[PDB]
Chains A and B, each alone.
With several copies, the nearest count.
Chain A
Amino acid sequence: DKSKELHAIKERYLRKFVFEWDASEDTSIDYNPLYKERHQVQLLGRGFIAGIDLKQQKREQSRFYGDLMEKRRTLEEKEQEEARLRKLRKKEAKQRWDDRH
Chain B
Amino acid sequence: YYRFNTGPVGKGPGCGFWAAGWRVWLFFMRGITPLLERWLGNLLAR
| Majority secondary structure of chain B interface residues (helix, strand, loop or mixed) | loop
Q: Number of contacts between A and B (CB, 8 Å)? A: 13
In the complex, B41 has a CB within 8 A of chain A? no
Q: Report the minimum CB–CB distance from A59 to chain B (whole Å).
A: 9
Q: Which of A6-14, A50-58, A83-91 contacts B (4 or more CB under 8 A)?
A: A50-58
Chain A residues near B4: list those with CB within 8 A: 51
The residues in A between 32 and 59 inclusive whose CB is less than 8 angstroms from any CB of B are 51-53, 55-56
Interface size on A, residues (CB 8 A): 5
Tell me the residues in window 44-83 of chain A with beta carbons closer than 8 Å to chain B beta carbons: 51-53, 55-56
A56 contact set on B, CB distance < 8 A? 6-7
Q: Are A51 and B3 in contact (CB-based, < 8 A)?
A: yes
In the complex, what's the smallest C-beta–C-beta distance from B3 to chain A, in angstroms? Answer: 4
Residues of B whose CB lies within 8 Å of any CB of A are 3-4, 6-9
**Extra A-B contacts (11), CB below 8 Å, given A53-B7, A55-B7:** A51-B3, A51-B4, A52-B3, A52-B6, A52-B7, A53-B6, A53-B8, A53-B9, A55-B8, A56-B6, A56-B7
A interface, CB within 8 angstroms of B = 51-53, 55-56
Q: Can you give 12 contacting A-B residue pairs, CB < 8 Å?
A: A51-B3, A51-B4, A52-B3, A52-B7, A53-B6, A53-B7, A53-B8, A53-B9, A55-B7, A55-B8, A56-B6, A56-B7
